[PDB]
Design a protein around this ligand. Structure first.
Ligand SMILES: Cc1cc2nc3c(=O)[nH]c(=O)nc-3n(C[C@H](O)[C@H](O)[C@H](O)COP(=O)(O)O)c2cc1C
Ligand code: SF4
Ligand code: SF4
Ligand code: SF4
Ligand code: FES
Ligand code: FES
Ligand SMILES: [Ca+2]
Lengths: 156, 146, 905
């Protein structure tokens, strides 16, 4: 049971006249559904395929190729801590240990109440202020393991 | 767009041009030129073998050229302040400037601009100011993770 | 060109890539991601060779031979240590995550990956870490899925998407977690999903029908045969074991069906293994169906024919040329009737007249792929001649191929072909009563009744050439679409008009003939293709005879008191009540058949004939090419009481017993000579295959591989004494190991592909002169007729518009790939793939009757009321009603006929 809304369909069409190929709006349509629901369910792939005209296999391959498009359901807030080389020099291991101590989950798993989802990510473009952690609209920098409980309590 | 800088009739020249911003979806391989072209078309970001070449058949088979942000920002200086003046900035085989800097357990990480021919030690104790207390120079990597 | 391989001079084609040039010369290079039909992408990194810049170079450069063109003076090395080390390393990297599954994998002994692991010499493992696993999707009843065995070579997605034009198979994920399959569980909707079991080098896609009763490739008894499920006549290798037909492999024919079959011809073989088949002759005395052997059955049949006043014979288009001709000799050519109806025979004879008298070259199925514009008139190609639909898809992608070739891109750079050819494709205009499976690539699809489709063709012919009869009553936007089609066909170098007898309209065939003639008159290299219904429909049309209605009138009037029905159920071509009444009036009915049909209850004698797996013969495909199919196995080898002879053998011995009162089990070559003596229009079937005296350096051709096992134990449960090896007096093959299957043998009928080190279906590379080309020493089969010098004239009979009359409903044929050919519906694995019988209605007609979707409505035809659930078809026109041809109770003769009393049940 899936149905694209009028606003989502209008946004997808608005992205569609930007390019000369309706296939080129597949990533942006998936991101639109991602913003408007939090994850891409099973019927959303078929809905995007029906709206765009490309087959559902292409939309499924695009959704599963990119890491920032989620096909499994997540919590209200996602945690994307950087684990690349500069943040490894800056010591993201203490941040990961503090996150696993607080949330009592594993990287890739979600909490029982859906409060947070612990994920690693790629480079965040904030090497000079590493380590960095990406929440939905915030790029937290200069992370310390003592400040992790203070930072996690401001998101509900 | 409200100032007429993009769209139709750009200051009476008649050249038609428009720019759109496409956000990525989190994959490192998208940075390659052929893979960027493939991901722009809405497919999986797989690179294309040479031959063919993206200058001949790039985005949707059309002529397409992809340039870096730093190259597209160095272009106005070359065009406006002359060509021979741009050649007279760095006296080496490479002509121009470059955004440079250090990162990772240093005193002053950041970004500055340096001409070609600058030695790597001149950013350590001058711009970065060295490292923190009790750290020995074991290794360094110049051009990112690759 | 000129290449230097390890110092040896070789002459190759300059346009070919280095891998295909070296494979054509017999040199062994490991490869996974390259296929001759799918092009090249360079994923598997397996075909590395060291290329040198000049004659004296030491280091060289490792290069990929599937990307490197075979230019003149190209110096390469294959067996030098660096290239072998790299290829062994690539095999080792493929072997890191590969499961320990070879004993429990259906591809064992038939695996490309096993062959290339052994060829590279990699046998020692130094990987000690974990191996990735994947969950297995459900792909339906045909294809079994196992994603642990994948090597990410991207051949399946390339074939299924680019070649086959499918939409529900893709690659998901990144790095080493790439998954190949559907987005969810479901049946693979493509009609050519079965070719994945040969395209995939590993055991990801396996034959599930074979997996139910599985045996290895070395244990299979193979024969070269022709698929009997439609008129296209794709060459196949049926392989059997323990007396049952086990698998249908693709047999390479560079003219017809090179690497690919369709799903009906690959998985519809299950009727051979049915347990209700007649195995011994049966005579009904009183109500006792007693069982005879061959001799007393022949003697009693000859007697009971001898004191009859007239004997008639009803042949079938399922039967071969030899069996129908033997029936024709038995009953006389005056009393011989074809088993098809009058309208079907009229359409078939018109199609034959267009093919062999129209002056337009009918193309081979491989040659269909090299045409620039395709107009399909009235024929549902994907549901009736599916391999022609695949070739039409290739011809449509030919525009992208030509556009790439105009910009210095070779034909094997398929990625650059699709890059240059983004959405431009050759013009395809399909016409049907509803939507087809070619509409995703068609430049236009015309949904109209068959009269309107014929009128569209007539208008196209008149607009192309004014000498054709004009059409009055064309709506202006439809006229603009006619102009678009005419502009597409006139600019094409090689146009192709495809029609057939499945539409149930003579006028569509006439319109297609006139379009082909008009395009011929302009100077174009036009071709015409005609799709018939059954395997030997063209052969029965060439042989000729009366229609089934004449035979039924002869039986009902009483002029004939003896009827011999050869391999015909008689209900697909005439109404059941009339056939049953005629066969009940006839005091002697003799059914020579290999499938238990409904008319055997009225039959007085049943001669247990043999199917294609247990018989030889010749069949003529839709293009007029005679092709010989050979016996796969002896039926009596395992069950000694089985008397299952060839139909021509039964009828020839019956004729001999009727004449001179002794049985004569003849030889196949004698019947071939009798055909080419009595019937000069079938005189080309002698050249279809050599006779039984044909040898390769003195020895015959082996049916089974060199490692055929269990020969002293496969029949040990019946008797510990080994039986006779079955003697083959008919053909050049032997039912044994002791024969010849060398790839360089001067022969054209190859039972199976096997080479030392190439156990996969890639041994066809060894069996070809050049890879992706023809079979070496010529492809098997011969065209019966050449292209005529003078053509036909324009058919002036332009049909009127379709006027929907009240109370009468025009039956629109909706063919199904699984359910239309009768023998395929008999197969038990097709009963889950076929759809439920739904009657298709227009929304306006459904509103007129007030019935919704899914409601059961009843209709009466020939005094019998049958109920079906209603499906709403938007693409249908008003006044018509869609019916599935070929299913149980809905004969294909119903197409184009009126229907009465359409009301809700
Ligand atoms: C694997 C790979 C990743 C790359 N990622 C980026 C990138 O993230 N950002 C970028 O500006 N260039 C990236 N590049 C470089 C360009 O995509 C391209 O290779 C070329 O150097 C661009 O030339 P330019 O500097 O004139 O724009 C990458 C190159 C490779 C091979
Ligand atoms: S696909 Fe080939 S290598 Fe893999 S388990 Fe099957 S037979 Fe063995
Ligand atoms: S499933 Fe088979 S054909 Fe497809 S990529 Fe894997 S090994 Fe190749
Ligand atoms: S296209 Fe016809 S002849 Fe060929 S495999 Fe399919 S059913 Fe058999
Ligand atoms: S390495 Fe973590 S922000 Fe760049
Ligand atoms: S066959 Fe050349 S890399 Fe795959
Ligand atoms: Ca035989």
């Amino acid at each position: 049971a899936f149905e694209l809304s009028a606003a989502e369909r209008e946004a997808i069409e608005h992205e569609m006249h930007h390019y000369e190929d309706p296939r080129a709006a597949s990533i942006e349509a998936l991101k639109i559904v991602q913003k408007q629901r939090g994850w891409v369910p099973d019927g959303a792939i078929h809905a995007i395929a029906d709206v765009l005209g490309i087959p559902a296999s292409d939309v499924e391959g695009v959704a599963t190729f990119y890491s920032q498009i989620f096909r499994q359901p997540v919590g209200r807030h996602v945690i994307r801590y950087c684990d690349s080389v500069v943040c490894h020099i800056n010591g993201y291991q203490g941040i990961q240990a503090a996150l696993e101590k607080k949330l009592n989950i594993k990287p890739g798993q979600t909490t029982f109440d859906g409060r947070f989802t612990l994920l690693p990510t790629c480079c965040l473009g904030n090497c000079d202020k590493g380590p960095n952690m990406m929440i939905d609209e915030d790029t937290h920098a200069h992370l310390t393991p003592e400040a992790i409980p203070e930072l996690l309590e401001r998101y509900k | 767009t409200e100032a007429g800088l993009l769209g139709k009739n750009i200051m009476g020249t008649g050249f038609d041009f428009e720019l759109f911003v496409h956000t990525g979806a989190g994959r490192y391989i998208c940075g390659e030129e052929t893979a960027l072209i493939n991901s722009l078309e809405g497919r999986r970001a797989n690179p294309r073998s040479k031959p063919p070449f993206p200058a001949t058949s790039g985005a949707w088979g059309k002529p397409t050229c992809v340039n870096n942000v730093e190259t597209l920002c160095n272009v106005p200086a070359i065009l406006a302040n002359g060509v021979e003046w741009y050649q007279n900035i760095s006296k080496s085989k490479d002509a121009g400037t470059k955004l440079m800097g250090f990162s990772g357990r240093v005193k002053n990480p950041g970004l500055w601009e340096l001409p070609f021919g600058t030695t790597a030690r001149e950013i350590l104790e001058d711009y970065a100011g060295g490292m923190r207390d009790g750290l020995k120079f074991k290794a360094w990597q110049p051009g990112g993770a690759g | 060109a000129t290449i230097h391989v390890d110092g040896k001079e070789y002459e190759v084609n300059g346009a070919d890539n280095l891998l295909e040039a070296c494979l054509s010369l017999g040199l062994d290079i490991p490869y996974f991601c390259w296929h001759p039909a799918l092009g090249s992408v360079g994923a598997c990194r397996q075909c590395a060779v060291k290329q040198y810049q000049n004659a004296e170079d030491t280091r060289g450069r490792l290069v990929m031979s599937c990307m490197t063109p075979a230019s003149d003076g190209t110096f390469i090395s294959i067996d030098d240590e660096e290239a072998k080390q790299f290829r062994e390393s690539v095999v080792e990297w493929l072997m890191t995550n590969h499961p320990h599954d070879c004993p429990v994998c259906e591809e064992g002994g038939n695996c490309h990956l096993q062959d290339m692991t052994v060829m590279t010499g990699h046998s020692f493992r130094r990987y000690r870490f974990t191996k990735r696993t994947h969950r297995n999707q459900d792909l339906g009843p045909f294809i079994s899925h196992e994603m642990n065995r994948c090597i990410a070579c991207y051949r399946c997605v390339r074939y299924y998407k680019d070649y086959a034009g499918g939409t529900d198979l893709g690659v998901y994920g990144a790095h080493d977690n790439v998954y190949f399959g559907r987005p969810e569980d479901g049946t693979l909707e493509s009609e050519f999903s079965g070719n994945l079991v040969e395209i995939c080098p590993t055991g990801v896609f396996t034959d599930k029908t074979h997996s139910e009763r599985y045996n290895r490739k070395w244990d299979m008894q193979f024969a070269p045969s022709i698929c009997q499920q439609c008129s296209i006549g794709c060459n196949i290798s049926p392989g059997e074991r323990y007396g049952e037909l086990r698998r249908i492999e693709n047999r390479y024919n560079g003219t017809v069906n090179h690497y690919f079959l369709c799903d009906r011809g690959r998985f519809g073989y299950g009727y051979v293994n049915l347990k209700d088949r007649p195995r011994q002759p049966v005579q009904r005395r009183g109500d006792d169906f007693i069982t005879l052997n061959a001799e007393q059955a022949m003697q009693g049949a000859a007697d009971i024919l001898r004191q009859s006043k007239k004997v008639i014979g009803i042949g079938s288009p399922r039967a071969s040329v030899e069996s129908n001709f033997a029936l024709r000799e038995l009953v006389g050519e005056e009393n011989f009737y074809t088993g098809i109806a009058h309208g079907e025979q009229e359409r078939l004879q018109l199609a034959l007249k267009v093919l062999r008298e129209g002056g337009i070259y009918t193309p081979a199925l491989r040659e269909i792929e090299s045409y620039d514009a395709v107009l399909v008139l009235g024929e549902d190609v994907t549901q009736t001649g599916a391999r022609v639909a695949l070739a039409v898809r290739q011809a449509v992608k030919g525009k992208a191929r030509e556009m790439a070739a105009a910009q210095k891109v070779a034909d094997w750079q398929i990625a650059a072909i699709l890059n240059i050819g983004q959405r431009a494709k050759h013009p395809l205009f399909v016409t049907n009563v509803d939507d087809t499976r070619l509409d995703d690539i068609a430049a236009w699809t015309y949904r109209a009744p068959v009269e309107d489709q014929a009128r569209l063709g007539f208008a196209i012919a008149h607009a192309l050439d004014n000498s054709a009869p004009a059409v009055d009553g064309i709506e202006p936007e439809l006229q603009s679409k006619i102009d678009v089609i005419v502009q597409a066909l006139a600019g094409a170098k090689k146009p192709l008009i495809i029609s057939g007898t499945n539409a149930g309209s003579l006028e569509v065939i006439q319109a297609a003939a006139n379009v082909a003639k008009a395009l011929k008159g302009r100077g174009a290299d036009v071709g015409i293709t005609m799709i018939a219904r059954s395997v030997n429909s063209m052969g029965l049309g060439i042989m000729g005879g009366g229609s089934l209605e004449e035979a039924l009138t002869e039986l009902e009037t009483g002029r004939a008191d003896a009827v011999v029905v050869l391999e015909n159920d008689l209900h697909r071509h005439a109404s059941a009540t009339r056939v049953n009444a005629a066969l009940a009036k006839a005091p002697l009915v003799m059914v020579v058949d290999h499938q238990r049909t409904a008319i055997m209850e009225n039959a007085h004698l049943v001669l247990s004939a043999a199917s294609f797996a247990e018989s030889d013969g010749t069949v003529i495909n839709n293009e007029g090419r005679a092709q010989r199919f050979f016996q796969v196995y002896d039926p009596a080898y395992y069950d000694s009481k089985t008397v299952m002879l060839e139909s021509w053998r039964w009828l020839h011995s019956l004729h001999s017993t009727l004449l001179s009162r002794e049985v004569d089990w003849t030889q196949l070559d004698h019947v071939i000579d009798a055909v080419v003596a009595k019937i000069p229009e079938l005189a080309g079937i002698k050249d279809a295959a050599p006779d039984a005296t044909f040898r390769i350096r003195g020895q015959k051709l082996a049916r089974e591989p060199h490692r055929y096992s269990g020969r002293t134990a496969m029949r040990a449960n019946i008797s510990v004494h080994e039986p006779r090896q079955p003697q083959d007096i008919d053909t050049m093959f032997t039912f044994s190991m002791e024969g010849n299957n060398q790839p360089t043998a001067h022969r054209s009928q190859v039972p199976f592909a096997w080479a030392p080190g190439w156990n996969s279906p890639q041994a066809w590379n060894k069996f070809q002169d050049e890879v992706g080309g023809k079979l070496r020493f010529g492809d098997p089969g011969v065209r019966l007729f050449e292209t005529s010098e003078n053509g036909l004239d324009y058919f002036t009979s332009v049909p009127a518009r379709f006027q929907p009359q009240d109370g009468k409903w025009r039956i629109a044929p909706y063919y199904h790939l699984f359910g239309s050919d009768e023998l395929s519906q008999r197969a038990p694995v097709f009963q889950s793939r076929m759809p439920q019988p739904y009657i298709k209605l227009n929304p306006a007609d459904a509103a007129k009757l007030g019935v919704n979707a899914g409601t059961r409505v009843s209709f009466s035809y020939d005094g019998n009321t049958v109920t079906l659930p209603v499906e709403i078809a938007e693409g249908l026109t008003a006044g018509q009603v869609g019916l599935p041809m070929g299913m149980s109770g809905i004969a294909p003769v119903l197409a184009g006929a009126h229907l009465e009393d359409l009301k809700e049940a």
